[PDB]
Each structure stands twice: as C-alpha cells, then as structure tokens.
Paper text:
Modifications by the enzymes PhzE,34 PhzD,35 and PhzF36,37 lead to the highly reactive aminoketone intermediate AOCHC (2).38 Two AOCHC molecules then condense to the tricyclic phenazine scaffold HHPDC (3), either spontaneously or catalyzed by the enzyme PhzB, which is a homodimer and belongs to the nuclear transport factor 2/ketosteroid isomerase family. can be further converted into different biologically active phenazines such as pyocyanin (4) by the enzymes PhzG,40,41 PhzS,42 and PhzM,43 respectively. PhzB in its homodimerized form displays binding sites for two substrate molecules (2) in each monomer. The C-terminus of one monomer functions as a lid, shielding the binding site of the neighboring monomer and thereby contributing to substrate binding and stabilization of the complex. To this end, we initially confirmed the target by performing cocrystallization of RAL with a PhzB ortholog from Burkholderia cepacia (BcPhzB). The active site of BcPhzB features the same amino acids as the target enzymes from P. aeruginosa (overall sequence identity: 58–59%, sequence alignment: Figure S1) but crystallizes more readily than the P. aeruginosa proteins.
Most ligands interacted similarly to the parent compound RAL. Representative examples of 10i, 11a, and 11e are shown in Figure 4A: the 6-hydroxy group of the parent scaffold forms two hydrogen bonds with Asp57, one with the side chain and one with the backbone, respectively. The carbonyl oxygen of the 3-benzoyl moiety interacts with Gln147. While substituents in the 4-position of the benzoyl moiety (series A) occupy the same subpocket as the 2-ethoxypiperi-dine moiety of RAL, substituents in the 2-position point toward a different region of the active site, which is also the binding site of the substrate analogue 7. The binding pose of the ligand’s core scaffold was observed in two positions, in one of which the 2-phenyl moiety is shifted upward and the 3-benzoyl moiety is rotated compared to RAL and 11a. To prevent a steric clash with the downward-shifted 2-phenyl moiety, the Trp76 in 11a flips, constituting an alternative rotamer without affecting the hydrogen bonds with Asp57, His73, Gln147, and Pro164*. All 4′-alkyl amines 11a–c were active with IC50 values between 3–4 μM.
Residue numbers in the entry:
A (entry chain A), B (entry chain B): 12 to 165
Write the structure that this text describes.
C-alpha cells in the first residue's frame, strides 16, 4: 500500500508541475490533465462564491476565454508542496500578465496565489486557486475599499 | 537524517494543532509557540501588503488587541497538511467570530482561510494567513466592488 501511495504521489507531482508550467497555446489542452468530471476554479472573488467550471470538456471550452482575458499569463515563483495524502498537493506561487476583461481598460495584473490540486486515478479531480481579489480590482482600475486603521494597532 | 526529519515533522504537527485550536484566554499565550524572532500575520489585506508582527514579545503584545477586535474567534474545519519539508505545514480551515473594529458597527465575521507554518528548532518561525478580504469588508458594512460580468462567461 505504501508502494502504491509513493507511486501515486510521484506521478501526481509531475501533473502538478505540468499544469503550473502550461503557457501559451498549450493552455488550450490543459483540461486534459483533469478527470472527465474534474472541476477547476477561482475560489476567491468579489461575491464570496467560487467561479468554478465543472467537467473536463467545459474546462476546455473555458480555456478559449482564459486565453482572451489573460493572453500572456505565467505562473512564477512556483513552490510545490506534497502532503501526507498522495492525491493532494498545494502550490504557492505568483502569477502575472495582461488582463483584458471586457468593458475594462487593458491592464497589468500581478498577484500571489495558492493552488490546491486533488487527484483521482492519476488526473486532477479538483483544482482551486485562492488569491486576494483586491489586487485584481487594482489591475482593472476598480477602487479598493480601505479599512480605517485609527483604532487598529499593529 | 530521516529519523531526525520524522521527529521534527511529528513534533511540529503537534504545534500546528495547538495553534489552530487556541481560543479564549489561551490566546494570551499563543505567542510562546514562536521563536524569539518569529513572525506572524495576515498576508491578504485591502492594501496588498501584509499586516505582520515580528518578534515573540510583540506577538504577545498584539494578542491583547486580537482579543479586543475578535473577542470570541474560533478556527473550524481544520485540515492540517504536512509537506516534504518537515518544517513547513499548510492548513485549510474556516474561522468565525464577532468583529469589533473601532469605529465600525459590531459585526459577525466568517471566512475561509489558508495558513502557512514554517518551523525552526521546534517553534514557529513564520506563520501567515490568507483569506478573501471581501468577506471581511462585508462583516464591517463596507461596500464590496463588483466586477461586471456581462462580457465574461463561465
Ligand atoms: C478554469 C476555472 C475558472 N477560472 C477562473 C479564473 C479567473 C477568473 C477571474 O479572474 C474572474 C472572472 C472571470 C469570469 C469568467 C471568465 O471567462 C473570465 C474571468 S469574474 C471575476 C470577479 C472577481 O471579483 C475576481 C475574479 C474574476 C475566473 C475564473
Ligand atoms: C500578529 C498577527 C497579525 N494578525 C492580524 C490578523 C487580522 C488582522 C485584520 O483583520 C485586519 C486589521 C487589524 C489591524 C490591527 C489590529 O490590531 C487588528 C486588526 S486592519 C485590516 C484591514 C484589512 O483590509 C483586512 C484585515 C485587517 C490584522 C492582523
């Protein structure tokens, strides 16, 4: 059983590596790293609800929109964390690139991200990314609220 | 070497568990889980810069303000992730409690969190927590910007 867990972890790590280094036109095929019913998404948004895409083929359809809205996106400063679960990885990284959201001025977006990858049968069953939406607001020219600090010492 | 790494991971895990379960008056002594020069803080804020405190004694001083602003805070749904680094852990959890920020109405704050814990010689050298600040804005009655989605399909 330990041999099976070790083998799963090693293979899954290669998939995480491949995902994190998928750039440019290869983004059109990144969905093939998911199970048929795999889910990917952004878990931190202005609404408090995730923007999640469910199903490998729907993830592939979304990559068209991803490549339009973030045409040169790269992940950088990538640190991959294996865990005691051979099917669960975390990644700390940054990401950056142009942001071209319809109805907003073209901007430059940079942020810090955490990703969660859960695997089933050697492919990604659930990917989730987490960031501070305030930095995306800034990239879109959206005013960020400020918490008044007068009575809040650090 | 492997035995030493195994020993470090097992002890460090106990410190993470203790930190995550610390609530109530025990919060006044949570800083004793840190190295003398240890750092803790919130990495996701409206400004884009962390609110971090460096030094065990300064962390202890801050606990007074933590108990004022978050008088009944509890971490729930705790999942601890060991990693390939015996001195690095991640935690996925939620947190909840009253929020009592000076000059804002008293509110009820709930959020999802990720924590990072890095250890040195059996104590926490760096703790960092990550959340979506939009949920904290809501708890304070602060208006959250909304990204227009008319052109952005999911
Ligand atoms: C592959 C799974 C989906 N992955 C993502 C990745 C990034 C985003 C994203 O940046 C955001 C939106 C979006 C929706 C649909 C679309 O076509 C493109 C962008 S709306 C919105 C509001 C905010 O407050 C913050 C971020 C976003 C959304 C989903
Ligand atoms: C030593 C560990 C530091 N740990 C924390 C934990 C939580 C916060 C926090 O919620 C925030 C503030 C705060 C500052 C000083 C203080 O006394 C109490 C609260 S201001 C602010 C603005 C935002 O946009 C979002 C969050 C916060 C800050 C620091």
């Amino acid at each position: 059983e330990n041999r099976a867990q070790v083998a799963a972890r090693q293979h899954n790590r290669k998939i995480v590596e491949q995902y994190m280094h998928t750039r440019g036109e290869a983004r059109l095929k990144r969905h093939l790293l998911f199970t048929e019913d795999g889910v990917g998404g952004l878990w931190t948004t202005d609404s408090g609800q995730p923007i999640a895409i469910r199903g490998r083929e729907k993830l592939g359809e979304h990559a068209v929109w991803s490549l339009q809205c973030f045409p040169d996106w790269v992940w950088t400063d990538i640190q991959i964390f294996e865990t005691q679960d051979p099917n669960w990885f975390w990644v700390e990284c940054r990401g950056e690139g142009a942001i071209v959201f319809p109805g907003y001025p073209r901007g430059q977006y940079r942020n810090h991200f955490l990703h969660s990858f859960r695997f089933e049968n050697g492919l990604i069953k659930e990917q989730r990314e987490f960031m501070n939406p305030c930095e995306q607001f800034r990239s879109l020219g959206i005013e960020v609220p400020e918490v008044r600090r007068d009575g809040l010492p650090s």
